Amino acid sequence: EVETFAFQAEIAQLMSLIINTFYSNKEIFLRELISNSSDALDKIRYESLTDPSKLDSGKELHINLIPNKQDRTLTIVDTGIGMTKADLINNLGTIAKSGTKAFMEALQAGADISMIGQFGVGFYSAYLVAEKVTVITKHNDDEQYAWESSAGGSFTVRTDTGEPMGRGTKVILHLKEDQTEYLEERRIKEIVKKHSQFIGYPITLFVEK
Ligand SMILES: OCc1ccccc1OC1CCOCC1
Numbered sequence: 044e045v046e047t048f049a050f051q052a053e054i055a056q057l058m059s060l061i062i063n064t065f066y067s068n069k070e071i072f073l074r075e076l077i078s079n080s081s082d083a084l085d086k087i088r089y090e091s092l093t094d095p096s097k098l099d100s101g102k103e104l105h106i107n108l109i110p111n112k113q114d115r116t117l118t119i120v121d122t123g124i125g126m127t128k129a130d131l132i133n134n135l136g137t138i139a140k141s142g143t144k145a146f147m148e149a150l151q152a153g154a155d156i157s158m159i160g161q162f163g164v165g166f167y168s169a170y171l172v173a174e175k176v177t178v179i180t181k182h183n184d185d186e187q188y189a190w191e192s193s194a195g196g197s198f199t200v201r202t203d204t205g206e207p208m209g210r211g212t213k214v215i216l217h218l219k220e221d222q223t224e225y226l227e228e229r230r231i232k233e234i235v236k237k238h239s240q241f242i243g244y245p246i247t248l249f250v251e252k
Pocket of ligand 1: 079080082083086121123125126135136137166178211212213214
């Protein structure tokens with residue numbers, strides 16, 4: 044059973060600006076997703092400080108980068124707090140409406156797209172390199188759900204029947220045809236070292252056969 048939702052008009056405008064603006068520094072998408080993962084890991088760690096049972100769904104707190112050249116997907120996995128269904132529908136746990144409004148006023152006032160993370164809507168930078176984004180998430184207080192959007196003003200939410208995650212979030216980037224460089228090991232390592240050297244969680248870059 045698949046539910047189709049319309050993006051709020053401001054979020055649809057943010058997504059089309061990310062997709063249509065000529066802007067060569069696309070690699071910052073990975074810094075933004077890793078930083079989101081770090082924030083999600085910070086949240087579950089803080090909750091575990093007064094309730095250790097919050098980690099019954101998984102004691103390890105990490106970030107995995109899984110490239111797959113056959114599927115042409117880059118997957119960012121974290122074992123953070125995850126998102127409920129309401130969180131997914133409500134712009135994936137962000138205040139995206141007010142964040143987009145501030146971001147667009149900054150762009151007309153000199154800012155560039157690399158600054159998107161300062162306005163709390165860094166997730167949507169995924170559409171700099173992805174034609175379609177799938178978000179699989181599991182929160183302790185809800186079931187596993189799958190969020191998906193190819194932009195175009197709508198997204199879908201369904202119960203995920205795939206591989207159980209325990210707890211955390213999985214961002215699957217179905218990359219554009221001309222953006223497969225972000226599946227190469229040395230390019231991913233370069234970006235992680237350049238923009239994510241101070242992330243307080245182990246970032247493991249998977250290799251392929
Ligand atoms: O796993 C991190 C993540 C993945 C996809 C979308 C958003 C997102 O980050 C939100 C803010 C941090 O915590 C709540 C979720």
